[PDB]
Design a protein around this ligand. Structure first.
Ligand SMILES: CN(C)C(=O)CCOc1ccccc1Oc1cccc2cc(C#N)ccc12
Lengths: 521, 401
């Protein structure tokens, strides 16, 4: 129905006017179809025939499981005012508050049921064809710019009276859907829903009847929402010849399945497409990737489920290291049943850093989803955290955290000293490199000079000369350098890196009993 | 019903469409209670989908109470109104305020919730209270009176301010008063007790003439471009380190002659050594406190502030507009409960107040923190009604100060 709701006043972008696109008559059997629809639409108030009162025009169309009208409004859309955004995100099943009964009422003829502002109707005119019959829209036209936002506003207002009288029942508004939950007996609940239908009916809004109410499991935005548990719809990943396109679709499904399937790891499969490359360009299958996907098919061989949220119970997140710069986390309120899961990654950095980064990802998500931060049970001890940050240049803060001993625990693999020692050496280590052609040294023993190389970078050489300082190094020792590059790297106390030379320096630093470094101009 | 000053954006400019940050449930209920009272009082009215604009809203904890405050982020609207709206009706920045021995800071923002806001400008104050987990579309409002945090608010109210302040400003000719946003900066060369009485007279004088005040003492006499120096002690390590920072110094001031002190070994020597070099360091230390000339403030250029984590509850900062060009240098410190984040918050709010007094603008900050961590907890200690620009640093070189 046309609806007794008030209309949102519309304007055109300042100093613009209605679209004057003309139509190309195309098929004329379709014109017989289009006259059929437009006669019904005039019969229910949706459109009204108009004279040639200098109106504007927009195209038509007839595209049809095998017709259906489709005005192109692109030209009007470009001249209509801007509206509030509609709904950027989607509610997460982990955030859903548990309810005794749930009901999916699918409104019918949504946009067509909400009147359109009178003074803006002229601009929705569309002509139907060797003269031509005229027509304008009386309700919210499909594909018009302000249809989605004005329906959402209208539905929000139509519900205010009924919510008022029903503070117990919770209604979610999504697109053309209402998801409606309660904590009362089914017979009670079936009565309340039936009141919602009649309320909506009076306003022009049709809904499914009891036999036609969708029944669970609800397949919705890529999940299965069961009555008391939720999961992802069955993720499906196949051959041997793959594409960039095939790799991308696959990493999509494993990120997707990773919100409830713990331990998914997609790193290997991701690095493969790390370059611009192409879309059809077939890509080789690395063996470590064929492992990840092999492990991944094992996680997905058996099903797992999330539970819904209870805001009375408290929120607990746990992190556990996976190796290779990958971490995996699980939020729950009771230890068995996870609200949801997920994973973290990094783009060469100490573990405590990458750990405190993971806590960041979780806090952000916790606030977006439950409006509360999750209490944390991490595999680390104050001794390890307090010292890392306190001599970390960067600011960091982590919410309540209790220790859990679930190796692999994260720890400080080594540690530099703050003041010099009871006597070791110098190791003034340089890395002379000719940017025109393919150094190393220490003046403690003065046994400097080990080996240059081709394509060796002065930055690699200086860092290698510090590793070269580690060569003659014994126990408690002290090195020095004029290369700022080197200092920042070992000072960051990294625990793994891409150049194993730097990983060797960690093995040296991990081995040596007391180290102290310094820089000079 | 006062006549509404009309507000025009610099033509060719649209209104803010900033996205609202997700908030915690504690803060949303707070904003819902605040916003409901504000809608009863007429200060704000709910709006429709044909308003496209948005600016972000946060909740903070005011001075120290349970009482939650609502804080609007008009950074975007400020850049699109106050620029040429200040040029229209701007507050002249008083030069002497940097000179006085004490400067106190009076919140005067609640007064703005009286003067009605021009009807055609209201749509651009749209803001949104968020919901949680996308459960509902947010709650939407605009303003009908001068909003706090819009730099056009003091610009419009400045005429009312001058009338109430006319008598206090004659009986007290020595006092420098500056308005910036929701704050009234008062400086006097009086004694601390005397200064505090004069402030209390001012608050009283303001209270009785309607302008509701709450009912932060700065000492800019002790602010300068603090020179880089080192306390006296010298081992090789101490010598080499001291040798180092002098090289970074030759930059901010070409005149150092480290080679004179550089005379040293050329074997294990991290032990001890006796120091002419004594004379050389003495002359340099004189040149060190020398005020670096060639340092000029251009109003066209923006103000950049950088902060560095020193350690043990203390922080150092440098405000410049160009490479080097160090217009101010200083230190911040705390006792306690301070964390990496909370101190930085208090630091920033001390580095902003300083640029406001000195140059009447806030500085755009480079911050030593992961962006998302800042974005999550900055409001948990923010207590200013304004918000500076900020970007996040990544690679901290050992600047050596
Ligand atoms: C979801 N469920 C069975 C629960 O048991 C969890 C409780 O979910 C609700 C709580 C209040 C209102 C409505 C609730 O239900 C929903 C919330 C959000 C999206 C929904 C999408 C569909 C579809 N297609 C069906 C129901 C939905």
């Amino acid at each position: 129905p046309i609806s007794p709701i008030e209309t949102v006043p519309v304007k055109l972008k300042p100093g613009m006017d209605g679209p004057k696109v003309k139509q190309w008559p195309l098929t004329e059997e379709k014109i017989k179809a289009l006259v059929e629809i437009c006669t019904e639409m005039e019969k229910e108030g949706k459109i009204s025939k108009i004279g040639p009162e200098n109106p504007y025009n927009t195209p038509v169309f007839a595209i049809k499981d095998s017709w259906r009208k489709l005005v192109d409004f692109r030209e009007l859309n470009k001249r209509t005012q801007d509206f509030w955004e509609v709904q950027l995100g989607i509610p997460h099943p982990a955030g859903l508050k548990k309810k005794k009964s749930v009901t999916v009422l699918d409104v019918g003829d949504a946009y067509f049921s909400v009147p359109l502002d009178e003074d803006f109707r002229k601009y929705t005119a569309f002509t139907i064809p060797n003269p031509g019959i005229r027509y304008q829209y009386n309700v919210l036209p499909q594909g018009w710019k302000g249809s989605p936002a004005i329906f959402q506003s209208s539905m929000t207002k139509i519900l205010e009276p009924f919510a008022a009288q029903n503070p117990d029942i919770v209604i979610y508004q999504y697109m053309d859907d209402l998801y409606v939950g309660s904590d009362l007996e089914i017979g009670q609940h079936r009565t309340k829903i039936e009141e919602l239908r009649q309320h909506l009916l009076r306003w022009g809004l049709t809904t499914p009847d009891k036999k036609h109410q969708k029944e669970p499991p609800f397949l919705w935005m890529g999940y299965e929402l069961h009555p008391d548990k939720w999961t992802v719809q069955p993720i499906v990943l196949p051959k041997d010849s793959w594409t960039v396109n095939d790799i991308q679709k696959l990493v999509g499904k494993l990120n997707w399945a990773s919100q409830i399937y713990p331990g998914i790891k997609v790193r290997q499969l991701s690095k493969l497409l790390r370059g611009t490359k192409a879309l059809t360009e077939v890509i080789p299958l690395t063996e470590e990737a064929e492992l990840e996907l092999a492990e991944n098919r094992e996680i997905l061989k058996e099903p797992v489920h999330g539970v819904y949220y209870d805001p009375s119970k408290d929120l607990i997140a746990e992190i556990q290291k996976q190796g290779q710069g990958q971490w995996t986390y699980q939020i729950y309120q009771e230890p068995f049943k996870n609200l949801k899961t997920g994973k973290y990654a990094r783009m060469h950095t100490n573990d405590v850093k990458q750990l405190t980064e993971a806590v960041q990802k979780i806090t952000t998500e916790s606030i977006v989803i439950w409006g509360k931060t999750p209490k944390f049970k991490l595999p680390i001890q104050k001794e390890t955290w307090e010292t890392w940050w306190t001599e970390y240049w960067q600011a960091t803060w982590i919410p309540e955290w209790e220790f859990v001993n679930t190796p692999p625990l994260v720890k400080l693999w080594y540690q530099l000293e703050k003041e010099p020692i009871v006597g070791a050496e110098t190791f003034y280590v340089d890395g002379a490199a000719n940017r025109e052609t393919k150094k190393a040294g220490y003046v403690t023993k003065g046994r400097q000079k080990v080996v240059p190389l081709t394509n060796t970078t002065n930055q690699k050489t200086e860092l290698q000369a510090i590793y070269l300082a580690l060569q003659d190094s014994g126990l408690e020792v002290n090195i020095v350098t004029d290369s700022q590059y080197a200092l920042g790297i070992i000072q960051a106390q990294p625990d793994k890196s891409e150049s194993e030379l730097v990983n060797q320096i960690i093995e040296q630093l991990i081995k040596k009993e007391k180290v102290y470094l310094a820089w000079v101009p | 019903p006062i006549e509404t000053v009309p507000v025009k954006l610099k033509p060719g400019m649209d209104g803010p469409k900033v996205k609202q940050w997700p908030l915690t449930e504690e803060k949303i209920k707070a904003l819902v209670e605040i916003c409901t009272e504000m809608e009863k009082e007429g200060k704000i009215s709910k709006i429709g989908p044909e308003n496209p604009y948005n600016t972000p809203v946060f909740a903070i904890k005011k001075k120290d109470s349970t009482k939650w405050r609502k804080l609007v982020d008009f950074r975007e609207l400020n850049k699109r109104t106050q620029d040429f709206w200040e040029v229209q009706l701007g507050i002249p920045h008083p030069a002497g305020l940097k000179k006085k021995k004490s400067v106190t800071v009076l919140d005067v923002g609640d007064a703005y919730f009286s003067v009605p806001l021009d009807e055609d400008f209201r749509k651009y104050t749209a803001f949104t209270i968020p919901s949680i987990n996308n459960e509902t579309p947010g709650i939407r409002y605009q303003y009908n009176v001068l909003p706090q945090g819009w730099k056009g608010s003091p610009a419009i109210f400045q005429s009312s301010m001058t009338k109430i302040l006319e008598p206090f400003k004659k009986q007290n000719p020595d006092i420098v008063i500056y308005q910036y946003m929701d704050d009234l900066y008062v400086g006097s060369d009086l004694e601390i007790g005397q200064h505090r009485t004069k402030i209390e007279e001012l608050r009283q004088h303001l209270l009785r003439w309607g302008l509701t005040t709450p009912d932060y003492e700065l000492h800019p006499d002790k602010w300068t471009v603090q020179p880089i120096v080192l306390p006296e002690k010298w081992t090789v390590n101490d010598i080499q380190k001291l040798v180092g920072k002098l090289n970074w110094a030759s930059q901010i001031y070409p005149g150092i002659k480290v080679r004179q002190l550089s005379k040293l070994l050329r074997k294990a020597l991290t032990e001890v050594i006796p120091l002419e070099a004594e004379l050389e360091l003495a002359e340099n230390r004189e040149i060190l406190k020398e005020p670096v000339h060639g340092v000029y403030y251009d109003p066209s250029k923006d103000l950049i502030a950088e902060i560095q984590k020193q350690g043990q509850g203390q922080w150092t900062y440098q405000i410049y507009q160009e490479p080097f060009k160090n217009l101010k240098t200083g230190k911040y410190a705390r006792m306690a409960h301070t964390n990496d984040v909370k101190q930085l918050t208090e630091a920033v709010q001390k580095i902003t107040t300083e640029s406001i007094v000195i140059w009447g603008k806030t500085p755009k900050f480079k911050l030593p923190i992961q962006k998302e961590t800042w974005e999550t907890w900055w409001t948990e200690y923010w207590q200013a009604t304004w918000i500076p620009e900020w970007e996040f640093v990544n690679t901290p070189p050992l600047v050596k100060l």
